[PDB]
Amino acid sequence: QVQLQESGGGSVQAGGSLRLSCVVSGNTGSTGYWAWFRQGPTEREGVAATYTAGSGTSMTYYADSVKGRFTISQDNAKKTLYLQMNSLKPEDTGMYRCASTRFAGRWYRDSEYRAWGQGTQVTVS
Amino acid sequence: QVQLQESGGGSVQAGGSLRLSCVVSGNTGSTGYWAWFRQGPTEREGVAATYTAGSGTSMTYYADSVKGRFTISQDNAKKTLYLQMNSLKPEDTGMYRCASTRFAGRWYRDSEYRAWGQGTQVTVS
Ligand SMILES: C[C@]12CCC(=O)C=C1CC[C@@H]1[C@@H]2[C@@H](O)C[C@@]2(C)[C@H]1CC[C@]2(O)C(=O)CO
Numbered sequence A, B: 001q002v003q004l005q006e007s008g009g010g011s012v013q014a015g016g017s018l019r020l021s022c023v024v025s026g027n028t029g030s031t032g033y034w035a036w037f038r039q040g041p042t043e044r045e046g047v048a049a050t051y052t053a054g055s056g057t058s059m060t061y062y063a064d065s066v067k068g069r070f071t072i073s074q075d076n077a078k079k080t081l082y083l084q085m086n087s088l089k090p091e092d093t094g095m096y097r098c099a100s101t102r103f104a105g106r107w108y109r110d111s112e113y114r115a116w117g118q119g120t121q122v123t124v125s
């Protein structure tokens, strides 16, 4: 039922910017995590996430590696999650997967995410 | 466990007024920023904020485009932040989000805010 439709990847030079998007549809429930993961070699790392509570209040989280360079945000009205990627580095290269789940002990615990989007590729030369 | 519960948005004619409210609850800590951001197409801009120190003294900040038209204030006893919006203009239209965080290098650095309320819509015709 849940669909995670990604877009926005591309090839850029170090120092440049990209903006990833994930449009969700279907029966997500009201509460949980909506996250971006970078897939490299199998190797997979949390980049940023939001947690949205039943109250409607959300919380943002970033990996050390991207704090200060990336911004995660969501437009709930449009059911879209955004990852704004500035000051890109070669190490940011990878297949970016958007994932979502109701429950996880930590936002970056990929093993605890149920739903995974088809990724969008980011290449930084 | 922070909750940011917003109210007060609406539709008004240019020149009119609105008053936004955000009631906080939960474990905020004693120190940090409590801010209003305007969200348009995403794009977020800082509107106004307060910084509250552990001393109990607070400091107010405004964006250039609203200085002289808006007033931010908080009623600590009621744990409520207010944005009084006078002399409204069409460019003030947007989804107004209240955000809070312990640390930010600048009050308007939305990427550094951890907690985000469910917005309230402001439309100025
Ligand atoms: C993380 C969440 C719940 C856990 C999950 O498996 C998938 C998602 C991603 C989309 C989120 C959703 C819930 O939080 C409710 C949200 C915010 C929704 C986008 C728009 C939304 O439906 C609402 O705004 C409801 O008010």
Ligand SMILES: C[C@]12CCC(=O)C=C1CC[C@@H]1[C@@H]2[C@@H](O)C[C@@]2(C)[C@H]1CC[C@]2(O)C(=O)CO
Pocket: B024, B028, B029, B030, B031, B032, B033, B034, B052, B053, B075, B076, B077, B079, B080, B100, B101, B102, B115
């Ligand atoms: C910005 C702040 C700390 C940083 C944060 O993430 C969320 C908030 C918003 C509510 C503020 C809070 C602290 O400053 C302590 C405050 C003022 C509280 C409202 C009432 C309060 O608890 C007190 O008045 C304590 O004396």
